[PDB]
């Protein structure tokens, strides 16, 4: 505009412990033009495992922290959806 | 529904060196209806100081202006500086 900020939208998994990055600590984002991936900061919350059912609904999932671009334990117990 | 990811949209100042956080390394974000501030991660690009295009000088859309870029260090924008154009 004359007063516009630039928006960046990034995509996470919902959980009882907040928005989670993936196990590879690399989030998909989009600017008003393009799609790209950004590495999560160290210690951001990230998904370690999803306790899927063989068969919709929330699942139990375990939650870690990013450590140098990969999700590390020890795990915390959450529900994800 | 449960196939959707959760989007988080945060708002930055654009520049020749990419999207910038402010000098306090804290940005405005939106999740669904909630508006809130999040701390920028260490090493994110940020404005070192109070740079802006003075309202009087405006005569163009997205009129660009000189600005200085540092990196976030423990919630404050730190040098060394880089020279950028912001808009």
Author numbering:
A (entry chain A): 18 to 72, 79 to 104
B (entry chain B): 18 to 104
What does the paper say about this structure?
In the present study, the structure of Evasin-4 was determined by X-ray crystallography. The Evasin-4 structure consists of eight β-strands and one short α-helix and has an L-shaped topology with the N- and C-terminal subdomains oriented orthogonally. Superposition of all six polypeptide chains of the three Evasin-4 crystal forms showed that the rigid Evasin-4 protein core is flanked by two more flexible protrusions. The first protrusion is formed by the N-terminal region (Glu16–Leu25) plus the loop β3–β4 (Ser48–Thr51) that extend from the N-terminal β-sheet. The second protrusion extends from the C-terminal β-sheet and consist of the loop β5–β6 (Asp68–Tyr82), including the α-helix (Ala74–Gln77). Residues Glu1–Glu15 are unresolved in all three crystal forms as a result of high flexibility. The crystal packing reveals a large intermolecular interface of 2,380 Å2 buried surface area common to all three Evasin-4 crystal forms. This interface involves the N-terminal region of Evasin-4 that forms an extended intermolecular antiparallel β-sheet, predominantly involving strand β1 next to strands β3 and β4 of each molecule. However, size-exclusion chromatography (SEC) and multiangle light scattering (MALS) analysis in solution show that Evasin-4 is a monomer, indicating that the packing in the crystal may not be physiologically relevant. In addition, the six independent structures of Evasin-4, arising from three different crystal forms we report here, are very similar to each other, suggesting that the crystal packing does not have major consequences on the overall structure of Evasin-4.
